[PDB]
Design an enzyme around this catalytic site. Structure first.
Site, short mmCIF file in Angstrom:
data_model
loop_
_atom_site.label_atom_id
_atom_site.label_comp_id
_atom_site.label_asym_id
_atom_site.label_seq_id
_atom_site.Cartn_x
_atom_site.Cartn_y
_atom_site.Cartn_z
N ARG A 113 33.22 53.10 54.78
CA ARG A 113 33.63 52.40 56.00
C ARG A 113 34.54 53.28 56.84
NH1 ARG A 113 37.16 47.17 55.12
NH2 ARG A 113 38.73 48.80 54.73
N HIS A 149 51.17 48.92 64.81
CA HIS A 149 49.95 48.12 64.67
C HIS A 149 50.27 46.70 64.23
CE1 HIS A 149 46.29 46.84 62.22
NE2 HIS A 149 45.88 46.85 63.47
N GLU A 150 51.12 46.54 63.22
CA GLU A 150 51.44 45.21 62.71
C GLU A 150 52.38 44.44 63.63
OE1 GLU A 150 49.68 44.03 60.04
OE2 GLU A 150 48.75 45.99 60.33
N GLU A 182 43.29 41.79 66.15
CA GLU A 182 43.59 43.17 65.79
C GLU A 182 43.15 44.18 66.85
OE1 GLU A 182 41.83 41.11 63.76
OE2 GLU A 182 39.80 41.91 63.52
N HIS A 205 50.50 45.46 51.16
CA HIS A 205 49.37 45.73 52.04
C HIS A 205 49.75 45.41 53.48
CE1 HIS A 205 48.95 41.38 51.73
NE2 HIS A 205 48.70 41.49 50.43
N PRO A 206 49.29 46.19 54.46
CA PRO A 206 49.68 45.92 55.85
C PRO A 206 48.90 44.75 56.43
CG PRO A 206 49.12 48.25 55.49
CD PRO A 206 48.57 47.47 54.35
N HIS A 219 36.08 42.32 52.10
CA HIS A 219 35.77 41.22 53.00
C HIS A 219 34.63 40.34 52.50
CE1 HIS A 219 38.65 42.98 55.49
NE2 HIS A 219 37.90 43.59 56.39
N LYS A 268 20.28 52.26 55.82
CA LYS A 268 21.36 53.24 55.87
C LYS A 268 20.85 54.65 56.18
CE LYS A 268 22.82 52.56 51.69
NZ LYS A 268 23.85 52.68 50.63
N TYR A 296 35.53 43.52 62.97
CA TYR A 296 35.82 44.94 63.10
C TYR A 296 34.92 45.64 64.11
CZ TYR A 296 39.42 45.75 59.58
OH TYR A 296 40.61 45.80 58.90
N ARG A 353 29.63 50.11 41.06
CA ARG A 353 28.63 49.09 41.31
C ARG A 353 27.68 48.89 40.13
NH1 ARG A 353 30.36 52.04 45.54
NH2 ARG A 353 30.43 51.05 47.61
#
Lengths: 242, 597
Positions: free
Chosen positions: B255, B356-357, B384, B327-328, B487, B463, B497, B151
């Site tokens: 995350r 999952h997919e 999802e 990538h899934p 995202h 946080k 999510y 960052r």
């Protein structure tokens, strides 16, 4: 088994009249994807036949084959075509991934999803009408709550089970008060001679002994009679022999 | 001519090339992920710009007369996904500048280059590089570099680039009869037209606050358990009273807590449940791993798949000459089809993503004859949430016995399921308050009540009171900590999510009440029950023709968003973390800082 087809609102009328139907190479071989229909079973079509047969040629998705049903409502069944309650035909679908598709999008034949009203069964509507849902007119263009209908296909053979090109040939059967002209196949047996056997011919039924005939005949005849009005002659339906 | 007869005819010349101009960018993006050539990227651009202009060509010719003459319920629920004008309500210098700032925001996230400033002679690649060095490096100075510098060179110029991006984003949604851009993500959650079940966009602000109050006893016991097990690892870096440092959570931000599982093992004498050592003996291939996973779809009561799934999609990487990105992502490409591209390996994490997919395929299979505006989720996170019900049911030891996977005589005591449930606690509960404090940060910077100097000072103060982490170095007003993710840089929704973990738990708590299972819900399996599909088949076919308030009535029966499936799924996790936390500190506090020496 054509190389081209038509739109689902631009249905051609393949008028099958005064024909002999051969279902031993189409129904019994069955090279199609699915073979399922309602009303009349396909094994009854060899022993039952109808006055006028009409056919078409149209390719749709695999999701719209549930809409093709007698008494069906929904997405396709009231706005593109409608099957009546007396539908005595059958609906056959086949995947056409190698023939009917086109790379870089299939932009040639069009289909609809909604309409102004519920159409009649077997209605050929090719209109390009201007819609108005609200209270202010549209003067030919679309708008907020003003829409317009007419868009083409999206076919490509690289995807799954939903919207692959499925060629659906609806063979519509109709029995009228007129006598039948198009009837399907029926099996034959061997012919034995010099024995007291039964007769099941094309236009004869009886019991007798088949011997070699020594008389003259006309080839457009079915049988013949003697001086005592009894059936003493039979023509073979396959070979030109009495 | 009558006003009551005219319902809906929009789906003729809109809903047939909404797929088809996206179709020409569908396989062109799919060939971009399989065959990365010089001409397989150009067909994504000219065909994707035709679909990007298709949503703006019909929006300029839809500006005549208003909405309030409609009567049917099926008309209004598809009308909200088309009347959003997007970017076409601004000027010529303002609207086209948004298209150029979104292409320079995704380039430096994927092609970033940041490494060590002490010895910069060997400088490494980011995305395969820094994702896997976080797990094995047991050093305080080594984990300090991978969080701070990322960052500091990538996120240093996004801070003068995100400030005018928020300002132009307010103008495109305030002209769309909304209050802000903050309810544009809540615009899918807006339910109108049904009496008694009205769900407005202002109701969603208190509803996430209502489900966050009862997760504070559950999260603060997981906040005190990872901290108490890092005393023998980090003796003089982490305080037992204060919060954990944020540069040791296992990933780039924190995350997912998936890489902190091997260091916080409760009991090391028993082995974990493992399919990886038993896979190489029986010699499985790519044809087996989707066929018996599709046997899980037949046994509930969903019908079979034809030959179009097996000859089009491949599971093996096509050679070492051509690069294929794996990538899934379950490819929802339009009106109900799915081609699966997955680089499959002999991996348990690859095995659970096979269920999952394929769980996003079975949701879009049932409304395949529905329109494309109704071919979506009930919200953004509904797609999802119904996909990972097949992955948590396949991680159940009662399902692995019926197929022939693991040993037929495996011991199952009370100390066996606790190491499995804390693995699920860092996958489900560990990302749940992290989804809350970023979406509340998105809902506090869009309205514009705060100045420019409190833009990043409000981020590190949330946080230390929501997720309980503290940064080791302080940041000025030139850096960005939340804006370096996947995202936020590519302008995706982050609300999807938080509703993934909520709608998944509501369906699995009632699915084996139909299948009559006695015990805890982590032993619940939905297989060998033909009546278990009939509760789902009226829910899998409702899409957006019925809203999400009436979609929850046939399985759980709750019209609101509740927390009660999340409590009795973890009932050994609430009891067995209590007796080991008798002498430690419960919760966190806002006094400890690593830079306050």
């Amino acid at each position: 088994n054509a190389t081209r087809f038509a739109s689902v609102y631009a249905w051609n009328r393949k008028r099958i009249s005064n024909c002999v139907a051969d279902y031993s190479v189409l129904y019994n071989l069955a090279p199609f994807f699915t073979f399922k229909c309602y009303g009349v079973s396909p094994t009854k079509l060899n022993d039952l036949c109808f006055t006028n047969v009409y056919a078409d040629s149209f390719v749709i998705r695999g999701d719209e084959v549930r809409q093709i049903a007698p008494g069906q409502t929904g997405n396709i069944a009231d706005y593109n075509y409608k099957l009546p309650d007396d539908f005595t035909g059958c609906v056959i679908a086949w995947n056409s991934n190698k023939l009917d598709s086109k790379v870089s999008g299939n932009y040639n034949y069009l289909y609809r999803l909604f309409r102004k009203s519920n159409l009649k069964p077997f209605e050929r509507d090719i209109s390009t009408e201007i819609y108005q849902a609200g209270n202010k007119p549209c003067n030919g263009v679309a708008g907020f709550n003003c829409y317009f209908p007419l868009r083409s296909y999206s076919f490509r053979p690289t995807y799954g089970v939903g919207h692959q090109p499925y060629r659906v040939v609806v063979l519509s059967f109709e029995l009228l008060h007129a006598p039948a002209t198009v009837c399907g196949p029926k099996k034959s047996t061997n012919l034995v001679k010099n024995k007291c056997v039964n007769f099941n011919f094309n236009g004869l039924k009886g019991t007798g002994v088949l011997t070699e005939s020594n008389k003259k005949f006309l080839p457009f005849q079915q049988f013949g009679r003697d001086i005592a009005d009894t059936t003493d002659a039979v023509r073979d339906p396959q070979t030109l022999e009495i | 001519s009558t006003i009551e007869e005219q319902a809906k005819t929009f789906l003729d010349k809109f809903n047939h090339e909404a797929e088809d101009l996206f179709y020409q960018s569908s396989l062109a993006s799919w060939n971009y992920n399989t065959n990365i050539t010089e001409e397989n990227v150009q067909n994504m651009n000219n065909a994707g710009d035709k679909w990007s202009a298709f949503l703006k060509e019909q929006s300029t010719l839809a500006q005549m007369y208003p909405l309030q003459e409609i009567q049917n319920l099926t008309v209004k629920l598809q009308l909200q996904a088309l009347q959003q004008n997007g970017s076409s309500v601004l000027s010529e210098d303002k609207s086209k500048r948004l298209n150029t700032i979104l292409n320079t925001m995704s380039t430096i996230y994927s092609t970033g280059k940041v490494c060590n400033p002490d010895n910069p002679q060997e400088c490494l690649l980011l995305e395969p590089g820094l994702n896997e060095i976080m797990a094995n490096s047991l050093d305080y100075n080594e984990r300090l570099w991978a969080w701070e510098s990322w960052r500091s060179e990538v996120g240093k110029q996004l801070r003068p680039l995100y400030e005018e991006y928020v300002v132009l984003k307010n103008e495109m949604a305030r002209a769309n009869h909304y209050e802000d851009y903050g309810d544009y993500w809540r615009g899918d959650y807006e339910v109108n037209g049904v009496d008694g079940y009205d769900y407005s966009r202002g109701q969603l602000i208190e509803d996430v606050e209502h489900t966050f109050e009862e997760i504070k006893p559950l999260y603060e016991h997981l906040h005190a358990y990872v901290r108490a097990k890092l005393m023998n690892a980090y003796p003089s870096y982490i305080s037992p009273i204060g919060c954990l440092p944020a540069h040791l959570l296992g990933d780039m931000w924190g995350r997912f807590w998936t890489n902190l599982y091997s260091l916080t093992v409760p009991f090391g004498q028993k082995p974990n449940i493992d399919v990886t050592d038993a896979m190489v003996d029986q010699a499985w291939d790519a044809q087996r791993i989707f066929k018996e996973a599709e046997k899980f779809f037949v046994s509930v009561g969903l019908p079979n798949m034809t030959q179009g799934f097996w000859e089009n999609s491949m599971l093996t990487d096509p050679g070492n000459v051509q690069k294929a990105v794996c990538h899934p992502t379950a490819w929802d490409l339009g009106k109900g089809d799915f081609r699966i591209l997955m680089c499959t390996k002999v991996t348990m994490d690859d095995f659970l993503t096979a269920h999952h997919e394929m769980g996003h395929i079975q949701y879009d299979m049932a409304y395949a004859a529905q329109p494309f505006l109704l071919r979506n989720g009930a919200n953004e996170g509904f797609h999802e949430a119904v996909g990972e019900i097949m992955s948590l049911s396949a991680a159940t030891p009662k399902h692995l016995k019926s197929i022939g996977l693991l040993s037929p005589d495996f011991q199952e005591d009370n100390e066996t399921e606790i190491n499995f449930l804390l693995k699920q606690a860092l996958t489900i509960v560990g990302t749940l308050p992290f989804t809350y404090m970023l979406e509340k940060w998105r809902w506090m910077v869009f309205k514009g009540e705060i100045p420019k100097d409190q833009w990043m000072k409000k981020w590190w103060e949330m946080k230390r009171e929501i997720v309980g982490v503290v940064e080791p170095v302080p940041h000025d007003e030139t850096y960005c900590d939340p804006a370096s993710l996947f995202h936020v840089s590519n302008d995706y929704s982050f609300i999807r999510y938080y509703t993934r973990t909520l709608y998944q738990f509501q369906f699995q708590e009632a699915l084996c009440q139909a299948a009559k299972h006695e015990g805890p819900l982590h032993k619940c399996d939905i297989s060998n029950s033909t009546e278990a599909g009939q509760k789902l088949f009226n829910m899998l076919r409702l899409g957006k023709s019925e809203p999400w308030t009436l979609a929850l009535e046939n399985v759980v029966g709750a019209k609101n968003m509740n927390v009660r499936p999340l409590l009795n799924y973890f009932e050994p996790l609430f009891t067995w973390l209590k007796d080991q936390n008798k002498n430690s500190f419960v919760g966190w506090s806002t006094d400890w800082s690593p830079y306050a020496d």
